């Protein structure tokens, strides 16, 4: 019983995993690098804060 | 004729005062090693550094280019007391030292539970205290030094110069070599007793710390129980055995870290830390 | 700024007290020593923990012995698999692995090779390299009966036991038979093969005949911690 | 009967691969080709908080970044104050066998939990009494691998038992329930929305969830061992996933596949935990090597490495601003990366 | 993906040849240890034999000792037990097993509960 019970609701979440919209893997690439380029100077530990505001130094 | 000697003492004096300082500014800044375990390492640093900068550079200077006590009377009886008191806070140290070891390899599951900072701080207080009491009979009259207008030297009567020699060094090189002689017979037990038919190395670092210490302090000590034996001494042997036992604090730094696990491999993350 | 001032000084306060208690709980933590119990499903450990006493996923006994205290965690509701957890022990002053000599429907499965295995992976997990490990060989008297009975499984499922010979230090005790006591050691000498081929010198074992009704067994403990504390205490400064 | 559905989930799977498989004209890389690199990277020990009695394994920042929660086996908790480096709280934890902590979003409550397969929540701002306990969220049937907070309310925990579930906070009951994994439940990771989060698990493959349908929408099995760490990239729709395989891989919820590796000859160790900068730029992924990596998001090349650790790296993580990087070490040493 | 497909199998008299392949693919072969698992009828799964990355060091358990051989290869990425003079108790269906994590000599594959990196297995039957 367990078994077949175990299978079936396998294959019933497998065929919704079959239905499912996407997007083609060099936009979702472009939108990555979009984002990364985008977002480049507010990140402190790519762009480093000025010494004289950052309250760890 | 010009002799190099004149560096050779400096040269030692500054490297004792570079290594004590290193090793209790690198304890301090290195919080992780304020440990019980370390306390009594840093007393003995802190002793071995006093050594270096109120007692050695005296005789370094004075003794070898001058050969004569030009800081007058009174200062004779700072020094003579200072030296003594340093020194045998030093042997004591070790001592105590020697002792903790015994203590927490006989015991392991019960002496640990009560090592805590307290107790370290009141032994050595205790050494200290005893280290000082060792240089009253000469304040009060009862050995008085036999320095001269020129001269600085230890009082030679029997009945203060066995007592002290007897206190500083002769007591405390039996418990030492006691205990560490019970620490080799348990570290072997031990191994011994970890193997097996098939089932189909302390000796070399407790003999180094032995044959240092002796080496540097025996001579002296030995030569200053047998001093009022005059029946005169040359200077040569009287001032090399003492700068023996001044090298016995040069070396301590290089002893007591490098045989300890914790300590030796912190110290190499320095190379980083400058930066 | 006194909103500043004042607002730093309740939080070097609360820092301080904070500080206090945290030491006095490190001493508590020193005095205290952490012991992990391991071993098969049917194993003796559930007896051996009852007789320490005189839905959870971790079960507290504490014992006291000789004024030290000591901290036995049993292993409760969780998973067979033991690879990810496991690891949370790499600490602890030592591991007990109960497992039971019997030499036996009734051989459901056998569980000798598999203690076997999983003595082995233990061993050679890299975050237990430095515990140690008691083995506690349990069920000596099914062991001996089993052997009695001419029908052990010691001989059909290890065919090696035909060429061994009882090792010359053995120590056996009056009136055992010569066939328990070479089937005994024979258990004994696999699991110090397993655990002998390592040759690095951050581990070692400590075996045992035991059964789960001796009183001796919280001793054993003891006098294995202090031993290996003790060698610890050695490795530190440098004697081994 | 099982011929008869082992064969329909096979064809299920050729097909989903055969989608995937048509949709691979052009990779990450490829592309990335002419992006700038980002040259080396140096980090410098800032700050170093010590008072922990064992081995630490996970740390959460609060929403202020001020606020620190460190969980140790000693069996303390405690909270701590990034830049004074002072103590605010020790809280003693009644089981000493905790494996993950928590912040809460609004910093009224905190969480942890461990092999004692309870959740204790404890609550911080009690009018009089500096900390106690206000719910044990019992039901789990294996040690609590993770756990994170939603709201004030509701937290989602994660268990060894191959499961996961929601807890209501006020009643203590599991308001959903998440199946589906062979094997373990390592680490748990909220997207930016928090309606949805990503498990990963022993079964060397990652998993996606709703909160408010809890059933599975997305799975992944690009990696090949355990599944350490996972976190999800700052625009909310692509992960990164550190696992024993010593190679971290990258997956976009859209693309549906892993879109880069990262890994080298020289590296061979577990990863214990993986983290994103804010701009996602920079991969902060931890080592059992005693040291991080930072590995370029883009070019997958490294930019750095933060050593420093004695011993295992058991968690790292990142301040919401991404100002400031901290590391959590079996050492019980925490040290903050700026 | 790991994916794991054990071939052969089949009813024998007692004492007949048997040979087992499994057809590893979809991870790196050389940098896992493999290991042969199998479950009887109405028992609970156990080790059979083990082989080492490059195949140095390879162990039987006692009662398949001589009896069975392990064997794996690098270049066609698959690996073979060779049985011989099979026993009626050898009756019991077999699985091909990794262990979790590369480049460690210890393996937990005798999980009792569904594992991650076990193959379905072939069923193996030896009866007069
Ligand atoms: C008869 C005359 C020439 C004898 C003169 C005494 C000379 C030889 C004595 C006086 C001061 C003494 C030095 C004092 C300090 C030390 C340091 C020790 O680590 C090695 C010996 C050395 C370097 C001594 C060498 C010998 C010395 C120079
Ligand atoms: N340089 C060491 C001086 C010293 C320390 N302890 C002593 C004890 C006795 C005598 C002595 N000469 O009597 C000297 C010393």
Same mark, same amino acid.
């Given at each position: 019983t367990?078994?077949?019970?175990?299978?079936?609701?396998?294959?019933?979440?497998?065929?919704?995993?079959?239905?499912?919209?996407?997007?083609?893997?060099?936009?979702?690439?472009?939108?990555?690098?979009a984002?990364?380029?985008?977002?480049?100077?507010?990140?402190?530990?790519?762009?480093?804060?000025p010494?004289?505001?950052?309250?760890?130094? | 004729?010009?002799?190099?000697?004149?560096?050779?003492?400096?040269?030692?004096?500054?490297?004792?005062?570079?290594?004590?300082?290193?090793?209790?500014?690198?304890?301090?800044?290195?919080?992780?090693?304020?440990?019980?375990?370390?306390?009594?390492?840093?007393?003995?640093?802190?002793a071995?550094?006093?050594?270096?900068?109120?007692?050695?550079?005296?005789?370094?200077?004075?003794?070898?280019?001058?050969?004569?006590?030009?800081?007058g009377?009174?200062?004779?009886?700072?020094?003579?007391?200072?030296?003594?008191?340093?020194?045998?806070?030093?042997?004591?140290?070790?001592?105590?030292?020697?002792?903790?070891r015994?203590?927490?390899?006989?015991?392991?599951?019960? $002496?640990?539970?009560?090592?805590?900072?307290?107790?370290?701080?009141?032994?050595?207080?205790?050494?200290?205290?005893?280290?000082?009491?060792?240089?009253?009979?000469?304040?009060?009259?009862?050995?008085?030094?036999?320095?001269?207008?020129?001269?600085?030297?230890?009082?030679?009567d029997?009945?203060?110069?066995? $007592?002290?020699?007897?206190?500083?060094?002769?007591?405390?090189?039996?418990?030492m070599?006691?205990?560490?002689?019970?620490?080799?017979?348990?570290?072997?037990?031990?191994?011994?007793?970890?193997?097996?038919?098939?089932?189909?190395?302390?000796?070399?670092?407790?003999?180094?710390?032995?044959?240092?210490?002796?080496?540097?302090?025996?001579?002296?000590?030995?030569?200053?129980?047998?001093?009022?034996?005059?029946?005169?001494?040359?200077?040569?042997?009287?001032?090399?055995?003492?700068?023996?036992?001044?090298?016995?604090?040069?070396?301590?730094?290089?002893?007591?870290?490098?045989?300890?696990?914790?300590?030796?491999?912190?110290?190499?993350?320095?190379?980083?830390?400058?930066? | 700024?006194?909103?500043?001032?004042?607002?730093?000084?309740?939080?070097?306060?609360?820092?301080?007290?904070?500080?206090?208690?945290?030491?006095?709980?490190?001493?508590?933590?020193?005095?205290?020593?952490?012991?992990?119990?391991?071993?098969?499903?049917?194993?003796?450990?559930?007896?051996?923990?009852?007789?320490?006493?005189i839905?959870?996923?971790?079960?507290?006994?504490?014992?006291?012995?000789?004024?030290?205290?000591?901290?036995?965690?049993?292993?409760?509701?969780?998973?067979?698999?033991?690879?990810?957890?496991?690891?949370?022990?790499?600490?602890?002053?030592?591991?007990?692995?109960?497992?039971?000599?019997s030499?036996?429907?009734?051989?459901?499965?056998?569980?000798?090779?598999?203690?076997?295995?999983?003595?082995?992976?233990?061993?050679?997990?890299?975050?237990?390299?430095?515990?140690?490990?008691i083995?506690?060989?349990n069920?000596?008297?099914?062991?001996?009966?089993?052997?009695?009975?001419?029908?052990?499984?010691?001989?059909?499922?290890?065919?090696?036991?035909?060429?061994?010979?009882?090792?010359?230090?053995?120590?056996?005790?009056?009136?055992?038979?010569?066939?328990?006591?070479?089937?005994?050691?024979?258990?004994?000498?696999?699991?110090?093969?397993?655990?002998?081929?390592?040759?690095?010198?951050?581990?070692?074992?400590?075996?045992?005949?035991?059964?789960?009704?001796?009183?001796?067994?919280?001793?054993?403990?003891?006098?294995?911690?202090?031993?290996?504390?003790?060698?610890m205490?050695?490795?530190?400064?440098?004697?081994? | 009967?099982?011929?008869?559905?082992?064969?329909?989930?096979?064809?299920?799977?050729?097909?989903?691969?055969?989608?995937?498989?048509?949709?691979?004209?052009?990779?990450?890389?490829?592309?990335?080709?002419?992006?700038?690199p980002?040259?080396?990277?140096?980090?410098?020990?800032?700050?170093?908080l010590?008072?922990?009695?064992?081995?630490?394994?996970?740390?959460?920042?609060?929403?202020?970044?001020?606020?620190?929660?460190?969980?140790?086996?000693?069996?303390?908790?405690?909270?701590?104050?990034?830049?004074?480096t002072?103590?605010?709280?020790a809280?003693?934890?009644?089981?000493?066998?905790?494996?993950?902590?928590?912040?809460?979003?609004?910093?009224?409550?905190?969480?942890?939990?461990?092999?004692?397969?309870?959740?204790?929540?404890?609550?911080?701002?009690?009018?009089?009494?500096?900390?106690?306990?206000?719910?044990?969220?019992?039901?789990?049937?294996?040690?609590?691998?993770?756990?994170?907070?939603?709201?004030?309310?509701?937290?989602?925990?994660?268990?060894?038992?191959?499961?996961?579930?929601?807890?209501?906070?006020?009643?203590?009951?599991?308001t959903?329930?998440?199946?589906?994994?062979?094997?373990?439940?390592?680490?748990?990771?909220?997207?930016?929305?928090?309606?949805?989060?990503?498990?990963?698990?022993?079964?060397?493959?990652?998993?996606?969830?709703?909160?408010?349908?809890?059933?599975?929408?997305?799975?992944?099995?690009?990696?090949?061992?355990?599944?350490?760490?996972?976190?999800?990239?700052?625009?909310?729709?692509?992960?990164?996933?550190?696992?024993?395989?010593?190679?971290?891989?990258?997956?976009?919820?859209?693309?549906?596949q892993?879109?880069?590796?990262?890994?080298?000859?020289?590296?061979?160790?577990?990863?214990?935990?993986?983290?994103?900068?804010?701009?996602?730029?920079?991969?902060?992924?931890?080592?059992?090597?005693?040291?991080?990596?930072?590995?370029?998001?883009?070019?997958?090349?490294?930019?750095?490495?933060?050593?420093?650790?004695?011993?295992?790296?058991?968690?790292?993580?990142?301040?919401?601003?991404?100002?400031?990087?901290?590391?959590?070490?079996?050492?019980?040493?925490?040290?903050?990366?700026? | 993906?790991?994916?794991?497909?054990?071939?052969?199998?089949?009813?024998?008299?007692?004492?007949?040849?048997?040979?087992?392949?499994?057809?590893?693919?979809?991870?790196?072969?050389?940098?896992?240890?493999?290991?042969?698992?199998?479950?009887?009828?109405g028992?609970?799964?156990?080790?059979?034999?083990?082989?080492?990355?490059?195949?140095?060091?390879?162990?039987?358990?006692?009662?398949?000792?001589?009896?069975?051989?392990?064997?794996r290869?690098?270049?066609?990425?698959?690996?073979?037990?060779?049985?011989?003079?099979?026993?009626?108790?050898?009756?019991?269906?077999?699985?091909?097993?990794?262990?979790?994590?590369?480049?460690?000599?210890?393996?937990?594959d005798?999980?009792?509960?569904?594992?991650?990196?076990?193959?379905?297995?072939?069923?193996?039957?030896?009866?007069?």
């Open positions: 367990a078994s077949i019970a175990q299978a079936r609701k396998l294959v019933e979440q497998l065929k919704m995993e079959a239905n499912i919209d996407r997007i083609k893997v060099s936009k979702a690439a472009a939108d990555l690098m984002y990364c380029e985008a977002h480049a100077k507010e990140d402190p530990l790519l762009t480093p804060v010494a004289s505001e950052n309250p760890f130094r | 004729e010009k002799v190099v000697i004149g560096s050779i003492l400096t040269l030692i004096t500054l490297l004792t005062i570079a290594g004590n300082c290193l090793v209790v500014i690198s304890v301090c800044f290195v919080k992780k090693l304020r440990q019980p375990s370390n306390y009594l390492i840093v007393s003995l640093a802190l071995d550094l006093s050594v270096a900068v109120a007692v050695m550079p005296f005789v370094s200077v004075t003794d070898l280019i001058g050969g004569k006590w030009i800081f009377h009174f200062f004779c009886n700072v020094f003579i007391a200072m030296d003594v008191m340093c020194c045998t806070a030093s042997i004591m140290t070790l001592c105590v030292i020697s002792i903790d015994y203590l927490g390899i006989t015991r392991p599951l019960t $002496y640990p539970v009560r090592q805590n900072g307290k107790c370290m701080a009141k032994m050595i207080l205790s050494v200290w205290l005893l280290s000082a009491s060792i240089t009253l009979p000469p304040l009060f009259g009862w050995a008085q030094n036999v320095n001269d207008d020129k001269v600085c030297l230890i009082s030679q029997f009945g203060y110069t066995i $007592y002290s020699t007897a206190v500083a060094f002769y007591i405390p090189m039996s418990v070599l006691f205990m560490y002689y019970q620490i080799y017979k348990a570290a072997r037990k031990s191994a011994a007793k970890h193997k097996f038919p098939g089932f189909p190395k302390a000796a070399t670092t407790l003999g180094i710390i032995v044959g240092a210490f002796t080496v540097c302090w025996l001579p002296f000590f030995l030569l200053s129980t047998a001093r009022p034996f005059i029946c005169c001494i040359p200077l040569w042997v009287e001032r090399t055995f003492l700068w023996l036992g001044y090298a016995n604090s040069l070396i301590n730094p290089f002893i007591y870290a490098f045989f300890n696990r914790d300590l030796r491999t912190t110290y190499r993350s320095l190379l980083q830390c400058q930066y | 700024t006194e909103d500043q001032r004042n607002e730093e000084k309740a939080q070097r306060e609360a820092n301080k007290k904070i500080e206090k208690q945290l030491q006095k709980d490190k001493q508590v933590y020193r005095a205290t020593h952490r012991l992990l119990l391991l071993g098969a499903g049917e194993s003796g450990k559930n007896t051996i923990v009852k007789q320490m006493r839905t959870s996923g971790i079960f507290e006994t504490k014992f006291q012995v000789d004024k030290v205290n000591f901290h036995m965690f049993d292993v409760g509701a969780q998973r067979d698999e033991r690879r990810k957890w496991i690891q949370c022990f790499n600490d602890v002053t030592a591991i007990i692995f109960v497992v039971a000599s030499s036996y429907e009734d051989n459901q499965t056998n569980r000798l090779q598999a203690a076997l295995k999983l003595f082995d992976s233990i061993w050679n997990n890299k975050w237990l390299r430095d515990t140690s490990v083995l506690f060989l069920k000596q008297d099914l062991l001996a009966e089993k052997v009695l009975a001419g029908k052990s499984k010691i001989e059909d499922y290890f065919p090696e036991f035909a060429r061994y010979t009882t090792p010359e230090d053995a120590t056996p005790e009056p009136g055992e038979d010569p066939r328990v006591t070479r089937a005994k050691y024979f258990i004994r000498d696999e699991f110090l093969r397993i655990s002998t081929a390592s040759g690095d010198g951050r581990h070692y074992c400590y075996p045992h005949f035991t059964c789960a009704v001796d009183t001796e067994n919280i001793r054993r403990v003891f006098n294995d911690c202090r031993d290996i504390i003790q060698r205490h050695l490795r530190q400064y440098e004697l081994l | 009967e099982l011929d008869q559905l082992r064969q329909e989930a096979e064809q299920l799977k050729n097909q989903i691969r055969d989608a995937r498989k048509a949709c691979a004209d052009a990779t990450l890389s490829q592309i990335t080709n002419n992006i700038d980002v040259g080396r990277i140096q980090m410098r020990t800032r700050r170093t010590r008072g922990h009695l064992a081995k630490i394994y996970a740390m959460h920042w609060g929403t202020d970044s001020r606020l620190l929660v460190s969980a140790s086996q000693d069996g303390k908790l405690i909270i701590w104050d990034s830049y004074t002072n103590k605010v709280h809280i003693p934890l009644r089981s000493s066998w905790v494996m993950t902590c928590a912040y809460a979003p609004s910093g009224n409550y905190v969480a942890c939990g461990g092999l004692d397969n309870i959740c204790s929540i404890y609550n911080l701002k009690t009018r009089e009494g500096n900390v106690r306990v206000s719910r044990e969220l019992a039901g789990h049937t294996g040690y609590l691998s993770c756990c994170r907070f939603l709201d004030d309310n509701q937290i989602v925990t994660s268990s060894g038992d191959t499961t996961c579930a929601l807890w209501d906070i006020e009643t203590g009951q599991q959903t329930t998440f199946t589906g994994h062979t094997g373990d439940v390592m680490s748990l990771s909220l997207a930016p929305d928090t309606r949805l989060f990503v498990s990963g698990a022993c079964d060397a493959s990652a998993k996606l969830w709703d909160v408010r349908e809890g059933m599975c929408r997305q799975t992944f099995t690009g990696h090949e061992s355990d599944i350490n760490a996972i976190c999800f990239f700052p625009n909310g729709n692509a992960f990164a996933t550190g696992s024993d395989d010593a190679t971290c891989r990258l997956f976009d919820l859209r693309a549906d892993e879109l880069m590796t990262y890994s080298h000859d020289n590296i061979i160790c577990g990863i214990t935990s993986v983290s994103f900068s804010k701009s996602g730029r920079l991969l902060l992924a931890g080592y059992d090597d005693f040291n991080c990596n930072v590995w370029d998001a883009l070019k997958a090349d490294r930019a750095g490495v933060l050593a420093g650790h004695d011993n295992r790296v058991s968690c790292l993580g990142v301040t919401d601003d991404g100002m400031a990087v901290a590391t959590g070490s079996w050492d019980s040493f925490l040290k903050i990366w700026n | 993906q790991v994916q794991l497909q054990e071939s052969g199998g089949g009813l024998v008299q007692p004492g007949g040849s048997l040979r087992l392949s499994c057809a590893a693919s979809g991870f790196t072969f050389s940098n896992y240890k493999m290991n042969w698992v199998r479950q009887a009828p028992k609970g799964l156990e080790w059979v034999s083990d082989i080492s990355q490059s195949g140095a060091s390879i162990s039987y358990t006692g009662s398949v000792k001589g009896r069975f051989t392990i064997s290869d690098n270049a066609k990425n698959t690996l073979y037990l060779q049985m011989n003079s099979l026993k009626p108790e050898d009756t019991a269906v077999y699985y091909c097993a990794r262990c979790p994590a590369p480049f460690t000599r210890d393996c937990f005798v999980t009792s509960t569904t594992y991650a990196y076990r193959g379905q297995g072939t069923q193996v039957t030896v009866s007069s």
